[PDB]
């Protein structure tokens, strides 16, 4: 009856996402050193055979049909060898990715990124050195997982080199805790790190991580943030009444004096001009306008015009 129960166990869908992956990865037998060396030679043979035929595509020279059919079978076998080597060492990736969970990366994402490290491990693996594949693949899988965590897990992405200094800052801070029994102040952290104290706080400022606007503490936090760019009614209405007042003040003046002030600050147009630009319209030198600008300003500072605008300082 165990055979029937065994068939029922193989055939189970399972709701959990990581499970279904554990079933399919445990359905390909592992390897021994001899098989690994065998697959390595098949991969290199299929790759070299593929490049030789590629050299023939540009150079022609169609080879005998029996040799041409066998060359393409080597490429067929080379790719099957690559797929077989990966499917066999797909579990090593899983065994390494277990330890890196709880860091903000989902388990499956850690497993897949580890699989990417396994691909480059197989592509760069050398069978002549006589070392087990797990020896060289362990390095590439860990590097792929860690490199992925630095480039992804952070909502505000941080470059690799900045993530590098933060981890060292943390390890230096945890050891100083064990040594001093108290949290090391930045001076001790900057000393141990060979950097300035004002730099470590800035680096510690980067370590800040965002908070979810939807956190509840019943109404959630998002309702407590007021829109900063939202237009205020009083200031918007005051700006209009301020525009109304400037028109009356500027309306009493020389029509050519009023034009200089309008172009200088931009006003109607919106782009503040310069003395030379205003000189081409009124046909005078930039010096003659500065004289006009100074005379109209002293006439504007004079109290009859400015007595009403005092409230508008801010």
């Amino acid at each position: 009856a165990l055979r029937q129960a065994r068939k029922d166990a193989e055939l189970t869908a399972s709701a959990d996402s990581v499970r279904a992956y554990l079933k399919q990865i445990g359905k390909v037998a592992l390897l021994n050193a001899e098989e690994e060396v065998e697959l390595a030679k098949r991969i290199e043979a299929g790759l070299y055979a593929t490049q030789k035929l590629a050299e023939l595509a540009e150079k022609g020279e169609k080879l005998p049909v029996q040799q041409r059919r066998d060359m393409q079978w080597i490429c067929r076998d080379g790719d099957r060898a690559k797929n077989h080597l990966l499917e066999a060492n797909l579990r090593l990736v899983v065994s390494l990715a277990k330890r890196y969970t709880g860091r903000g990366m989902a388990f499956l994402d850690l497993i897949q990124e580890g699989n990417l490290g396994l691909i480059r491990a197989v592509e760069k693996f050398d069978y002549t050195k006589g070392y087990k594949f797990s020896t060289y693949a362990t390095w590439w899988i860990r590097q792929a997982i860690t490199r992925a965590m630095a480039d992804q897990a952070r909502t505000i992405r941080i470059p690799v080199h900045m993530v590098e200094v933060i981890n060292k800052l943390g390890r230096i801070q945890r050891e100083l805790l064990q040594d001093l029994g108290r949290e090391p102040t930045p001076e001790e952290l900057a000393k141990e790190m060979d950097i300035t104290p004002e730099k470590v706080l800035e680096i510690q400022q980067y370590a800040r991580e965002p908070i979810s606007l939807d956190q509840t503490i019943d109404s959630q936090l998002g309702d407590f943030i007021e829109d900063s760019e939202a237009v205020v009614a009083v200031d918007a209405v005051s700006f209009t009444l301020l525009q109304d007042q400037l028109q009356s003040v500027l309306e009493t003046l020389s029509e050519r004096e009023a034009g200089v002030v309008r172009l200088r600050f931009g006003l109607t147009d919106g782009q503040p001009r310069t003395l030379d630009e205003i000189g081409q319209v009124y046909g005078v030198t930039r010096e003659r306008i500065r004289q006009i600008e100074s005379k109209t300003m002293s006439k504007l500072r004079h109290p009859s015009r400015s007595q009403v605008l005092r409230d508008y300082l801010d």
Partner: protein, 192 residues
């Protein structure tokens, strides 16, 4: 597949579902349903007709039930802003989107290199659940949880519930020109 593989075709995932919808006759399925409903008295075949007939009356293709592209909500509705002294706060959608875009791009990288179906299909279902978690989180399996096991808010969570857009920000609102305070007896007041 080894033998007989040239007489048929098969696949898995939403790709195969999209193909089954691509070759489909809502009329032939309906007309066959219309004679099967009464002749084979059937109750389950009748309830199935409402969806088959709904697609037949309108002009929308059933292909709309599978997504080849996912729309992205404007930024200001999923804001990321700072409050006190530089610390940041952002909406949950940004990370739900992040899981979708991240897994989609990793799938492109696996396909170009070429990969065993175990890795590609595993990535495809991950993309399937990431899009699911985005639209409705927790509807299928465990919800995507944030720090401290807090389920992320999903697009569907914005509408539903007493806190959704309807009963919270639509059927009721906070208004200006208003106030409150305690009440004391006004025995000397007129009724008005």
């Amino acid at each position: 597949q080894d033998r007989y593989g040239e007489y048929f075709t098969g696949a898995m995932g939403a790709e195969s579902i999209k193909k089954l919808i691509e070759n489909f006759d809502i009329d032939a399925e309906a007309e066959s349903l219309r004679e099967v409903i009464r002749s084979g008295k059937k109750l389950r075949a009748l309830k199935r007709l409402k969806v088959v007939a709904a697609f037949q009356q309108s002009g929308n293709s059933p292909m709309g039930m599978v997504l080849d592209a996912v729309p992205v909500i404007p930024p200001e509705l999923r804001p990321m802003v700072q409050l006190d002294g530089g610390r940041f706060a952002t909406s949950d959608l940004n990370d739900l989107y992040r899981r979708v875009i991240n897994r989609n791009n990793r799938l492109k990288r696996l396909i170009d290199l070429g990969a065993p179906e175990i890795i590609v299909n595993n990535e495809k279902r991950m993309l399937q659940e990431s899009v699911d978690a985005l639209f409705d989180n927790g509807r299928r399996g465990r919800p995507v949880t944030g720090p401290g096991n807090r389920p992320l808010k999903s697009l569907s969570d914005l509408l539903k519930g007493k806190q959704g857009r309807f009963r919270q920000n639509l059927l009721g609102k906070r208004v200006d020109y208003s106030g409150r305070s305690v009440i004391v007896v006004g025995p000397q007041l007129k009724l008005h």
